[PDB]
Ligand binder design. Structure first.
Ligand code: HEM
Ligand code: HEM
Lengths: 43, 106, 379, 81, 111, 62, 48
């Protein structure tokens, strides 16, 4: 826990967010086909 | 400001050891530790005497456990004799690794 | 090598994890529950397959079907009452298993611990669906109230409870689903067990002392095959003692009544294995709060590795945890009691303090005790 | 890999064992059991028994109350008045 | 495994061929030792306290001759089959077979 | 001198594992029968006349 | 209500005796196999 936290680590986190951010978008797309929200369909 | 409380604690510590199985077993307190990656390296750092000792002790101990027999009252580990022989070794190993983290962190 | 049967076949070498393996000397009787654990998995299966050789999975018949297995079919009665009782054992055994892991710090084997946990929960699902197959008053309702307890989830829940059921209630649709998943879980679980065994084979069996035994290791074949056979012998004993002398005793539920959807046993409750889960839900006023806390009951297991505070993975040398270990067990017994209790003041107030005690014992007390003991030893 | 030749390293330890056929499998069992059983139970009892005792009280009390409060149908509030 | 194996095979499966070769080996072993003065002197001395005052030398060949593959099989099974071993090592004995394993090696179910 | 009962038994049946096994097969057979017989008897004794075996008379062949 | 149970009690008696007999032998059989480890006493020998 404490060991993992570090001043140095931030670039990796920033990089992760984009890949992570990109990954997050896919789920919404993936969920949406199954979910079939009328509003989502409307979008 | 610990004179009475700590004094009770010192008495309590003997009871705790007495309460603890290792003292009853006769094996040293240091020997009892969960063999993980730091203990492991400490272990490896032991001299032949210290280290072969810890092997017989555990041998004699797992033998007893297998037979559900306790050692004679005369031959038991007394709290007053707390060989914390792993402690020295074990500290550094940790010390090294904590650093490693510091260097790695920055 | 030549004509060393074992390593000749590559396959037969893989079986030398039983015969040739390094097994610690010292070793309480507690470890026989691993083996018995498997024993039970194999017995349920053989039993299941024969019952599912004369069972039908419809509203109309299911009750009849079981009823027919226990009456007209030759030795179907014992097979079925052996199957019911077994599952009790299976759980009685499971909870010894996890006790041991809790107490001697076998759970240090994180990867093995995480499989265990999956194991435990998978069986848990199994047991929940099988009991519903016979489609009797207890089963019928128990499924509704558990499943519905999933509708606590805010956004989805509601939709999702309806998918699981295959409709708005628990008619045929649900009943055949449980039949199919009950059937296929145990097979999947066996794969898991073996995967569990795989990981454990990489570091061998911890001991009561809590120290490595590498300096004392024994033939598994010579010694531990008889122990295990002996273990069986006692295990079976208990399973037949139950099954032959008191078939229904341990099967609290007396509801041999075909399920009538308007009717209700005011006293609705899961079986002994699931009794603890029902109790956990009760102490929280809010539905959702109760479902979270129910999951956390069981799911809190995987934390304990991280909670470990002492330097001695063995509780054996630390009095204080030996005391709070036992109490948790007796708190667990206390909770099981609540499970079969009217949900009224007396029991409510008790359960609530038991559910806090359980999470304290696991989350907060023990971990501190660890530290203390370490500090008294000067560690 | 190989589990028997590769466990650990052990120097200077002698072991002495005997054959099954030369010894007895039941070594003064009554005599050892009593004293060993006795000696460990008494070192267990204190650490184990308490919490169970506790549950029993709570069971006992806990059932009394129920029966009372419910059988004491007049418990809550009296009749005459 | 191989050794014990050999034992077993011996008392169940000895073939005349095999015994006949060992036979002959024995003769030689027993003749060639007796080459030289020292050797003969020891046989004669020790023979007398051991076997008493006989010098079974020429007998041998006779005795050795009575050897049969059945003889060798029945004689071996008195002493090795079902009998409890006397095993010592001076480790690395970490892999040395458990007493019970060694023991079960003196009878033939499988292996 | 004669061999203790065990020694007798040993040399006749347990040296060779073929014999041993043969024994056990045989034994398993013999044993099942005696056990049952004895153990069934014992159990019927404890419930004299309670069981249909005892009670068939009443309505049988007049 | 319990046709099997009536048969079961009789079976239980047979089962009870066999299990008891089997258990006694196993404890004895089990003891012999594990006797060697239990019988053995290992004495540490000083290197020098
Ligand atoms: C450990 C895994 C399993 C557990 C915990 C388990 C448990 C149960 C339970 C508690 C019941 C209710 C019986 C009653 O009280 O009437 C049941 C019924 C049933 N189970 Fe199992 N079972 C398991 C595996 C299996 C397997 C593998 C099969 C099929 C191969 C199977 C087939 C059945 C059938 C057909 C019934 C319905 C008839 C009856 O009530 O006996 N079960 N199971
Ligand atoms: C399907 C149910 C299970 C079966 C058949 C099973 C079987 C076994 C067996 C036969 C052993 C070896 C003996 C022993 O230590 O008792 C074992 C060990 C172990 N099991 Fe399980 N198990 C099951 C469930 C679990 C669960 C639910 C977990 C934990 C979440 C778990 C975790 C462990 C661990 C950590 C060990 C090793 C302990 C040690 O010796 O240090 N097991 N299991």
């Amino acid at each position: 826990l404490t060991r993992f936290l570090g001043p140095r680590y931030r670039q990796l986190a920033r990089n992760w967010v984009p890949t992570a951010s990109l990954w997050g978008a896919v789920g919404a797309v993936g969920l949406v086909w199954a979910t079939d929200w009328r509003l989502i369909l409307d979008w | 400001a610990v004179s009475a409380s700590s004094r009770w604690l010192e008495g309590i510590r003997k009871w705790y050891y007495n309460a603890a199985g290792f003292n009853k077993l006769g094996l040293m307190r240091d020997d009892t530790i969960h063999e993980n990656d730091d203990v492991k390296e400490a272990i490896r750092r032991l001299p032949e005497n210290l280290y072969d000792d810890r092997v017989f002790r555990i041998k004699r101990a797992l033998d007893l456990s297998m037979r559900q027999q306790i050692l004679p009252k005369e031959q038991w580990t007394k709290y007053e004799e707390d060989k914390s022989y792993l402690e020295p070794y074990l500290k550094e190993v940790i010390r090294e690794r904590k650093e490693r983290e510091e260097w790695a962190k920055k | 090598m030549t004509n060393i049967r074992k390593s000749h076949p590559l396959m037969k070498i893989v079986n030398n994890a039983f015969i040739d393996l390094p097994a610690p000397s010292n070793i309480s009787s507690w470890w026989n529950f691993g083996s018995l654990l498997g024993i039970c998995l194999i017995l349920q299966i053989l039993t299941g397959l024969f019952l599912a050789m004369h069972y039908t999975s419809d509203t109309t018949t299911a009750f009849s079907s079981v009823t027919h297995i226990c009456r007209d079919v030759n030795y179907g009665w014992i097979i079925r009452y052996m199957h019911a009782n077994g599952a009790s054992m299976f759980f009685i055994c499971l909870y010894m298993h996890v006790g041991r892991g809790l107490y001697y710090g076998s759970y240090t084997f994180l990867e093995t611990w995480n499989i265990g946990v999956i194991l435990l929960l998978t069986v848990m699902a199994t047991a929940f669906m099988g009991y519903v197959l016979p489609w009797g008053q207890m089963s019928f309702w128990g499924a509704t109230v558990i499943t519905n307890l999933l509708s606590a989830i805010p956004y989805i829940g509601t939709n999702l409870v309806e998918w699981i059921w295959g409709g708005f209630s628990v008619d045929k649709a649900t009943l055949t689903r449980f039949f199919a998943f009950h059937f296929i879980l145990p097979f999947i679980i066996m794969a898991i067990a073996m995967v569990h065994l795989l990981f454990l084979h990489e570091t061998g069996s911890n001991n009561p002392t809590g120290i490595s035994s590498d300096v004392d290791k024994i033939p598994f074949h010579p010694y531990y095959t008889i122990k295990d056979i002996l273990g069986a012998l006692l295990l079976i004993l208990a399973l037949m003692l139950l099954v032959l002398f008191a078939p229904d005793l341990l099967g609290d539920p007396d509801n041999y009544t075909p399920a009538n959807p308007l009717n209700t046993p005011p006293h609705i409750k899961p079986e002994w294995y699931f009794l603890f889960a029902y109790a956990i839900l009760r102490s929280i006023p809010n539905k959702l709060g109760g479902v979270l806390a129910l999951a956390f009951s069981i799911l809190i297991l995987a934390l304990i590795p991280l909670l470990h505070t002492s330097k001695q993975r063995s509780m054996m040398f630390r009095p204080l945890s030996q005391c709070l270990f036992w109490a948790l067990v007796a708190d667990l017994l206390t909770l099981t009691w609540i499970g079969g209790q009217p949900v009224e003041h007396p029991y409510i107030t008790i359960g609530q303090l038991a559910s806090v005690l359980y999470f304290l014992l696991i989350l907060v007390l023990m971990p501190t005790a660890g530290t203390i003991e370490n500090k008294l030893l000067k560690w | 890999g190989r589990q028997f030749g590769h466990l650990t390293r052990v120097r200077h330890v002698i072991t002495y064992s005997l054959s099954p056929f030369e010894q007895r499998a039941f070594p003064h069992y009554f005599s050892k059991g009593i004293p060993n059983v006795l000696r460990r139970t008494r070192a267990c009892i204190l650490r184990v028994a308490p919490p169970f005792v506790a549950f029993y009280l709570v069971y006992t009390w806990g059932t009394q109350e129920f029966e009372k409060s419910k059988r004491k149908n007049p418990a809550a509030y009296e009749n005459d008045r | 495994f191989v050794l014990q194996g050999q034992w077993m095979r011996l008392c169940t499966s000895a073939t005349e061929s095999e015994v006949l070769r060992g036979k002959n080996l024995l003769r030689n072993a027993l003749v060639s030792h007796l080459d030289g003065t020292t050797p003969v002197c020891e046989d004669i001395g020790r023979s007398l306290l051991t076997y008493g005052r006989r010098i079974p030398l020429a007998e041998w060949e006779s005795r050795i001759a009575e050897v049969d593959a059945r003889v060798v099989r029945e004689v071996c099974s008195k002493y090795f089959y079902d009998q409890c071993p006397a095993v010592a090592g001076f480790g690395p004995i970490e892999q040395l077979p458990d007493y019970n394993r060694i023991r079960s090696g003196m009878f033939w179910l499988r292996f | 001198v004669a061999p203790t009962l065990t020694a007798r038994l040993y040399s006749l049946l347990f040296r060779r594992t073929s014999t041993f096994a043969l024994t056990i097969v045989v034994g398993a057979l013999f044993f099942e029968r005696a056990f049952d017989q004895g153990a069934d008897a014992i159990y019927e004794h404890i419930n004299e006349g309670k069981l249909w075996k005892h009670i068939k008379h009443k309505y049988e062949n007049k | 209500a319990e046709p099997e149970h009536d048969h079961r009690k009789r079976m239980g008696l047979k089962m009870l005796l066999m299990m008891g007999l089997l258990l006694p032998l196993v404890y004895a059989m089990k003891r012999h196999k594990w006797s060697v480890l239990k019988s053995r006493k290992l004495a540490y020998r000083p290197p020098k």
